[PDB]
Structure formats: C-alpha cells, structure tokens
Amino acid sequence: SMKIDVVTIFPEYLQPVRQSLPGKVDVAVHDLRRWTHDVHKSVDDSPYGGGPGMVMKPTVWGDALDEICTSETLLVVPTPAGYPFTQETAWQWSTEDHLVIACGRYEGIDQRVADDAATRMRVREVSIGDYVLNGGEAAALVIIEAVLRLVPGVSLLEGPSYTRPPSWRGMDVPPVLLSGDHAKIAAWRAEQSRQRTIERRPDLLG
C-alpha cells in the first residue's frame, strides 16, 4: 500500500503514469500553481548572487509541501546535483508508505525548502544519470516506474536474447540455445554477459 504525490507545474506530463496502474497503490498529481500567492501565479524568481535562469520560490514550495507531506513522508527531489538513484534505492523506496516527488526546473528549488523539510521528514535529492534535463518531470517518471514495478501488486549485463524464427535475414539463433544442454547454455550466457560487460560497461568490473 503506497501513496505517491507528485508536485509539478506540468501536471499533464504525469497523467500517463496515472493511466498505467493496473488494479489497485495510489498516484496523485498536483499543479504547483495551486499554492502560488499572486494573480500572476509566480513560481520562480531571479537567483541571489546573479546568474542565468530562475530559482523556484521557497514560499510557494513551502506551502505545497506543508499541505501534502507528513512526518511519515519520504520527500524525493529529482536534481542533476543529487545522490545517484540506483536499483538499490528503488528497492529501499518500494517499501515506503508515502512518497512525495517535488519536480523543479534544473536551476533548482531554493535550497531552504529541502533544508526546512529535512527537519521534519526524510528528504532525498537524487539524480537519475549524468545528463541535464530542463526539469525533474521525466526523472520522476523514471523513478515512479523503477519503484512501483518492485511493489508486489503491480554485477554483469544481460547478454543477447532470441526468439522465433530460428533463421531471420541470414542470421541464425546461436545453436547452443537449441541444444537442450542447459548447463552449457548457462555457461554460454555467462560468457556473453562477460564480453558485453567488458565492451559496454567496464566500470562494472573494476
């Protein structure tokens, strides 16, 4: 039983995830502008100390999180400056009762928001990879998917996979896979995994 609240200025970005859950979990999306104070519905402002872009306003985010979060909440803040989000993270968060995901522009949410929230609840600032996105929405989709697929209801790299037909455009499925020698098949797959990992992800081997 997990509740996920997502807060974003692009709520429609998150709706496909909502219309993706089978038969249960609860995922709610909130337009950040609901907590703005002015008729212009301002969510960001110029950065102190100068610089390009805008920083999201602490008064707006503070009100939103005050309403949505509780002491039991794990507040997830996607940011390119975060700790890395990994499969281990996904496993850890899969047993949480309440995730709140705060989606901001990459220039950031005023740091006092996360710092204030951390005095009352658990806060996790995380990156999903080494690339820059305009905002946290796509990263939220990745996190929601990686976490929810580990909830009951819903090393080395894996090598190549094959299915019918056995011959296709002049390429045959490796005959070992058809051999009925399942110990040999396992060893072949292990070697394919070794070769692929060396080639594509040597970092996984040290």
Added chain:
Amino acid sequence: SMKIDVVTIFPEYLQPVRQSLPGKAIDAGLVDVAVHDLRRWTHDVHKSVDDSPYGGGPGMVMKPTVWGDALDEICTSETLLVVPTPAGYPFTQETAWQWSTEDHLVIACGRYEGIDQRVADDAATRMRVREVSIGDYVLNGGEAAALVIIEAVLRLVPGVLSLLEGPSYTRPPSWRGMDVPPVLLSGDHAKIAAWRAEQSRQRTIERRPDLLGFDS
C-alpha cells in the same frame, strides 16, 4: 531541423513529450516527433509482438519480424537508431551533445525481456545503431528512457536557445528563520564566485565523489 520517430507498443505513454521543452520545440518547428504503434506492422489477428526465448528463461522476447518491418519503413541509411536497454552503453551528456546535431533519430522502445538481438544486428548493416542505458536501474520498458533521451537531446538543438551545481536561493532573504548566505547578497562577484565554487566542491565530494576521481 530534426525528426524523431518513436516506435512502441504503448504510444499513449509518449504523450508527455507534448509538454515542457519538447512541446515548445515542436510548436516552434525545430523538431517533429512522431509516435508509432509497433502493432501497425503485425499481420496476425492477435497482433503478436512477442514470443518465448530460445534457450529458456523468464518472460518473453520481442519478435524480430515485426520490428524488421517497422524499421524497414521508418529508417533510412542516414538514421541514427537508438535502442534503450539496461544492457546498453551509457547515455551521457556527451551523447546528448552528439545526437543534438542528427537529422533523424529513431527510438525503438522494447518491453518484456528485450528485443531479439538480430533486429539491432540487421539494422547495423544499413545504418548507425546505438544501444544505450540511461542509468543503473530496472524499468519495465524503454518508453520512459525514450522520454529522458528526447528531453536531454532537444534542449541542446540549435534554436532551442564536470562538477555539481551548488545550492541556489531567491527572495525573500529570510524565510522561516533561514537566511540566504550573506555573500550572495553582497554583490561581490569575486567572493560569490569563490563561495559557489566551494559549495560545488563540497557537494560533489559528498554526493558524487566519482566525478572527482574518488571511490564510491
């Protein structure tokens, strides 16, 4: 002027692309993004796209026949075929810069336990193929990875306008008894630059020591 074709069995999942930076890029005519239902290239009643793996194992593998027909129709020799997969080469910022100058990206989204390897192998005889992962975590399908790649690449395209960035602040200067670091209010560009550099170093060593050549 870039064209992106995305092929998937869940074309509805790719509608978030109609928003944010990608939506604005499309509306401004800098990119055209077209989403294709893979089942359009099936010929059986049940529109089957997957089958059990040779050699055993859990789950299903996407059929090469259907993918081959789809890619035959959509790709040319000039196409960069992008195949998101957890077993791919890493997609990084460098990759995003490289692909930002391509005329034509086709993104093949897989599901179940992946796409028959011969699809990528056959395609490579006629075009450039890149199998890529967007991070070290498990997803159900390549669709969310496609959205990440599109976002990362599109914001770099001409016309659409390291270490870790440290904390940022904006008004008011005091909030809930928490003050913006006084140096940021001082207007001293030298001192501000210095403090920001120190903040970034501190954050990088704590959160991403790998970026500076340290363990973990």
